């Protein structure tokens, strides 16, 4: 498909190297996301879940 290959130098350079992609910012366990809504009866230190 005429795709240039990925050598050893391309494992470190740029945004997709090991540094910016897997050394500093990792996917973490014990995690989750959702959409947010306003909670006007909560206390300041409380939150919905």
């Amino acid at each position: 498909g005429n795709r240039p290959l990925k050598s050893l130098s391309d494992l470190l350079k740029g945004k997709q190297g090991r540094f910016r992609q897997n050394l500093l910012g990792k996917r973490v366990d014990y995690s989750g996301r959702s959409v947010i809504v306003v909670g006007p009866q909560l206390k300041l230190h409380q939150c919905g879940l």
Binding site: N22, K26, R27, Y30, G32
Partner: protein
């Protein structure tokens, strides 16, 4: 949500996206935020275990 799920192949991070379980990318700017608080133990948690 994800407590413990599938894992990536070459590196051993948790995987990505709602199609799998995956975690949310605790990326570089969030590492800066928790450095700026000074929370060192939670950063060690989220990047090692």
């Amino acid at each position: 949500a994800r407590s413990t799920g599938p894992y990536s192949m070459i590196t051993q991070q948790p995987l990505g996206g709602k199609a799998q379980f995956g975690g949310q990318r605790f990326g570089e700017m969030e590492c800066w935020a928790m450095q700026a608080y000074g929370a060192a133990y939670t950063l060690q948690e989220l990047l090692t275990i």
